[PDB]
Amino acid sequence: KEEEDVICDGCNGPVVGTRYKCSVCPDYDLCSVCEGKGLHRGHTKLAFPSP
Ligand SMILES: [Zn+2]
Ligand SMILES: [Zn+2]
């Protein structure tokens, strides 16, 4: 199988639970830990679940 996984651009770890996808930068995502630490705060992100 091919699976589409989300990798955090802050820490390169898995994004499980809620994902924070940048609405400006292409193909850019933070995990909840990196989002809470304030990385990449200069752009609006979309917060939604991460199956
Ligand atoms: Zn992270
Ligand atoms: Zn961005």
Numbering used by the authors: -3 to 47
Q: From the publication, what sentences describe this entry?
A:
Intriguingly, the autophagy adapter p62/SQSTM1/Sequestosome-1 was recently reported to recognize N-degrons, the N-end rule substrates of the well-characterized UPS, and where ultimately these substrates are delivered to ALS8,9. p62 is a key selective autophagy adapter that plays a role in the degradation of various cellular constituents such as misfolded proteins and their aggregates, malfunctioning organelles, and invading pathogens. Intriguingly, it was recently reported that the central ZZ-domain in p62 plays a critical role in the recognition of N-terminal arginylated BiP/GRP78 by the Arg-tRNA transferase ATE1. Here, we present the high resolution structures of the ZZ-domain of p62 in complex with 8 different N-degrons including type-1 and type-2, and subsequently identify key determinants involved in the unusual recognition.
Therefore, we determined the structure of the ZZ-domain in complex with a variety of N-degrons comprising three type-1 N-degrons and five type-2 N-degrons. However, the side chain of the N-terminal residue of the N-degron is recognized differently. The side chain of Asn132 which undergoes a conformational change plays a critical role in interacting with the first residue of the N-degron.
